[PDB]
From Swiss-Prot, chain A:
Keywords: Cytoplasm, Dioxygenase, Heme, Immunity, Iron, Metal-binding, Oxidoreductase, Tryptophan catabolism. Induction: By IFNG/IFN-gamma in most cells. Exogenous inflammatory stimuli induce the expression of IDO1 in antigen-presenting cells such as dendritic cells, macrophages and B-cells. This is Indoleamine 2,3-dioxygenase 1. One of its GO terms (cellular component) is cytosol. Activity is inhibited by and MTH-trp (methylthiohydantoin-DL-tryptophan), modestly inhibited by L-1MT (1-methyl-L-tryptophan) but not D-1MT (1-methyl-D-tryptophan). It comes from Homo sapiens (Human).
Length: 368, 372
């Protein structure tokens, strides 16, 4: 009834639980820049401060939490440096003294050297009062890009949806051991509890409107999350000075990098990685290694869908269809969020096709 | 190992594969058992059309499902490439396309001939009481006469089986890391590297039984897929199973779980990084049998042997670990020579530079993992 060392916490699931906040003193030269990105980009001195930097060693980042915090600090500094004010004064070469420890640390954690969902959502937060529970008022992100980027809202809302699904993930072992022992009654309870938590997760998703402005997102934040895989601004990729001879390409942030949704697609026999199936497959590369491992474990198990269909059991079939419907709801609301935050401010098509097909693949998986 | 379908003696190979299908399918088997003669006469493509959408349901157990997947897979290649002179068909007939895709999605494999089919499930012993060697062994199917396919497939198979006796050690390695039996672990690593050096010695046989021209000109053509292939630039239409064309990669020994297995075990980070090699090797898993994908998965979800060895500051262990990494480096380095002989040189009398960079980078990634 538990998962091993997939780094899946009981309460926060795929999130890094109570992330680190400060680095060892050695790195105060790094942490400074990260703690003041909005103010350094305005003054136009971010890049100078980056380029006047010593090549620090990663070795004093001893444990996992600090290694991550550092990965976030560096990741943000990188985004900021590459996009600048985010008007077009890009850079195509990342400075030696930052590029080196970033790629070192990245290949140490088996993650790509670019800011990802695992960094700016999953490891970018804290409680205000540690004795109070997890909720937007009691919570705050550690780093931001610009003032009025609404990044506190964007990151936390996302995080809170992840944590909502966390209380459904801890059920999965119960599901499989129920399929084994044949304890039909349990299995039903488990499936129902999962769908409950996913409907919850939608209710949490509603908060996005309250804390993220459409223009603030599309115009400001979106820019700093952009990568260099197929990006015309850096059509060859980015040169990582002192680590790679040639440019390299890496995808910007997406919540395709959230293990939550892929996890439940897998669990429920929703065959989405078998084009989109390609994107979604690639996005795993940007998930923390243990989480990739976890999704993997799920695929190497017996199909819950098969099990339910064999049993000719109305109760089950509903319970299963309940979960599939919860996902269908989540993706459908998602499309509305994209309409509001990308599609409309883009005004003053291919992307909608992508999301619509994924949802559709989810809806086909119903038993009806 | 549980039900990863990894046999003790033949590893990833399908052990003692089926040879005949139920009588219902004698209309398939026929074509498969005579592909060389039907392509010559130019009647293969007729015989394929004049065919009746049979049902897959009489293929009850795994071994028969696989034999059928091979029969169909070969028939498909043969039909698509024809005489292999450059007339290619772009629509696979309904009465074969349907049961092929049915069976393929039943075994969770792509509907195209793959290493798992034409190497791992395409053989038999001549005398069942005699051991596994080229003289006592034979493939079940072939494409043309003088394609040297018996040699190509069996040599490959025999290398797989050589690495099989190293795979059965892996559980010993991990349970040694746990119980902290340093001595056990050393023995295990050494035994692994031994079996991989063996596997190279077996690889040597390729020169004896495969002709370079017979391979590059004949056999290579029938193993080609339609992923990024200009001949079928959109992919292939599977009549009665898919609206649009679909793309699928041709046979590669990138589809051998052996090498990816040991890369994983030894902390050799190939399927990570930006480039085309990591992505290719990651894709190729899709073309491995499902239980073998599952197995590679397990290995990644274990503690890193590399880490464990580096922590210990132990000369013996390092040497044992480096032994294995060296064995792989050797295998890949010989591999490059085989490519030079069989693709690179005959390609000369009729680009592949980019192609050699690929293999060279993979090997190089293997050589960097060395400790000393
Ligand atoms: C304004 C906020 C958001 C925008 C503009 C947005 C936009 C998009 C876009 C464009 C894609 C597909 C292409 C790409 O990622 O580049 C996508 C996919 C996805 N988004 Fe979002 N998204 C937002 C918020 C969220 C949130 C809060 C979640 C979950 C908590 C989420 C989950 C996903 C998932 C899981 C996918 C992959 C497709 C799928 O799983 O069905 N997104 N989103
Ligand atoms: C003898 C003729 C062979 C030729 C012409 C050949 C050619 C090639 C080519 C062209 C590739 C790159 C794949 C692509 O981009 O299409 C490749 C990869 C590979 N080949 Fe071969 N190969 C041969 C035999 C073997 C054998 C016998 C083995 C092992 C038993 C082997 C193991 C591999 C592996 C493992 C890869 C993936 C790269 C790697 O893991 O290092 N090959 N081969
Ligand atoms: N992709 C995206 N591009 O912009 N927002 C999204 C989105 N879902 O797709 N997810 C996403 C949501 C919040 C985030 F902070 C990040 Cl880094 C990624
Ligand atoms: N790739 C390849 N394309 O042709 N031969 C190879 C090769 N290694 O790369 N291995 C391989 C060896 C024997 C085979 F039958 C097949 Cl289908 C693939």
């Amino acid at each position: 009834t538990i998962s091993k060392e997939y780094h899946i916490d009981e309460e926060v699931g795929f999130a890094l639980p109570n992330p680190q906040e400060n680095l060892p003193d050695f790195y105060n030269d790094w942490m400074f820049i990260a703690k003041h990105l909005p103010d350094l980009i305005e003054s136009g001195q971010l890049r100078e401060r980056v380029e006047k930097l010593n090549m620090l060693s990663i070795d004093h980042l001893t444990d996992h939490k600090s290694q991550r915090l550092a990965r976030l600090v560096l990741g943000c500094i990188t985004m900021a440096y590459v996009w600048g004010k985010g008007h077009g004064d890009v850079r195509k070469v990342l400075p030696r003294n930052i590029a080196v420890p970033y790629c070192q640390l990245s290949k140490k954690l088996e993650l790509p050297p670019i800011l990802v969902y695992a960094d700016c959502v999953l490891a970018n937060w804290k409680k205000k009062d540690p004795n109070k529970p997890l909720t937007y008022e009691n919570m705050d992100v550690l780093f931001s890009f610009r003032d009025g980027d609404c990044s506190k809202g964007f990151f936390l809302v996302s995080l809170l949806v992840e944590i909502a699904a966390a209380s459904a993930i801890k059920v999965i072992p119960t599901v499989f051991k129920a399929m084994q022992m044949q304890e039909r009654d349990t299995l039903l309870k488990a499936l129902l509890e999962i769908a409950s938590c996913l409907e919850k997760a939608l209710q949490v998703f509603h908060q996005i409107h309250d804390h993220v402005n459409p223009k603030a997102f599309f115009s400001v934040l979106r820019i700093y999350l952009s990568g260099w895989k197929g990006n015309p601004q850096l059509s060859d990729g980015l040169v990582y000075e002192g680590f790679w001879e040639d440019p390299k390409e890496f995808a910007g942030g997406s919540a395709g990098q959230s293990s939550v949704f892929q996890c439940f697609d897998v669990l429920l026999g929703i065959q989405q990685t078998a084009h989109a199936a390609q994107f979604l497959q690639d996005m795993r590369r940007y998930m923390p290694p243990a989480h990739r491992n976890f999704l993997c474990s799920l695929e190497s198990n017996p199909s819950v869908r098969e099990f339910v269909l064999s049993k000719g059991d109305a109760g089950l079939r509903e319970a299963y269809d309940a979960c599939v419907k919860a996902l269908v709801s989540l993706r459908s609301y998602h499309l509305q969020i994209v309409t509001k935050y990308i599609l409309i401010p883009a005004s003053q098509t291919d992307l909608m096709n992508f999301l619509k097909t994924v949802r559709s693949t989810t809806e086909k998986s119903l038993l009806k």
